[PDB]
Each structure stands twice: as C-alpha cells, then as structure tokens.
Copies of this chain bind each other. A is one copy, B any other.
Amino acid sequence: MGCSWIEMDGKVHKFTARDKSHPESKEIYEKLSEVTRKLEREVGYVADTKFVLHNVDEGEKVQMLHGHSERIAIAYGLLRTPDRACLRITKNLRVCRDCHTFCKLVSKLFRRDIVMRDANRFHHFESGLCSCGDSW
C-alpha cells in the first residue's frame, strides 16, 4: 500500500502510514516532530500537515491525514544509523512533491545523502538537491 522500507547496511525495517491500531514506537514520532521543527528553524522549511472532512450525518467531521511513510522511515534512520550515514529508502508509490522537498532539506541540514527508490525512479538527494532535477 503506502509502504516504505529503510535498509541500513543490509538490515530492513518497513513503515506504513500512522495506524493507531499498530503504533510505532513513540520515540520515532518524537524524532520526526523534532526534525520538522529543526527544518523550520534552520532552513526556513514550510511544514505541511494535511486533513480532510467527510460529509457525515448529524453535521460534519474532520480527519487528520497521516504524514507519508517515508518521513517516519527517515526519522527512524536518523535515530538508528551513524551520523553522516546514507539513508536508503524504498517506496512502492511515487514520492509526492512535499515529501521530495522534505528529503531535499533533510539531506542538506543533516548532511546525509538519501537514496530513495520510489515506484518509478532512483532519487539521490545530496546537499539539498536531487539527481532527478525535480522532474519525476
């Protein structure tokens, strides 16, 4: 589905969008919010959060959309792999524009290359720029 995998010197962990029925370790979500804040503070990142509303009965309801799984995978990688180590992410869907931008900025600020294989392309993020040239 919307799955991402991180591969760390042969070792593999899978991540999905937020599922409160199967929560990841809170330490990982804490790292994500910490990285998001540092991106906002240190490189002027405009952090996105998405939500929807459904036309239910007796009024209306809003529902926060869960951030995409590769951001969780990247936070896990920043927690578990050495400083400056390349982060290798595999996705089964095409990386969206907002996640692609997130990856660029992470590669710059945390001084780690990111190699992402999404549905269609290898994206190599180095120092804030991607090998795809932002066409994918």
Contact = CB atoms under 8 A, between A and B. Distances in A.
The count of identical subunits is 2
B55 A46 contact: yes
Interface string A30-72: 0000000000100000111111111110000000010000000
21 contacts: A40-B55, A46-B54, A46-B56, A47-B54, A47-B55, A48-B52, A48-B54, A49-B52, A49-B53, A50-B50, A50-B51, A50-B52, A50-B53, A50-B65, A51-B51, A51-B52, A51-B53, A93-B94, A94-B94, A94-B119, A119-B120
Interface in A91-109: 93-94
Q: Which 7 pairs of residues, A with B, have the shortest CB-CB distance? A: A48-B52, A46-B54, A50-B52, A49-B53, A51-B51, A48-B54, A47-B55
Contact-residue size bin, chain A (C-beta under 8 Å from the other chain)? 10 to 19
A51 B51 CA distance: 5
Given A48-B54, A49-B53, 12 more contacts: A46-B56, A47-B55, A48-B52, A49-B52, A50-B51, A50-B52, A50-B53, A50-B65, A51-B51, A51-B52, A51-B53, A94-B119
Contacts of A93: 94
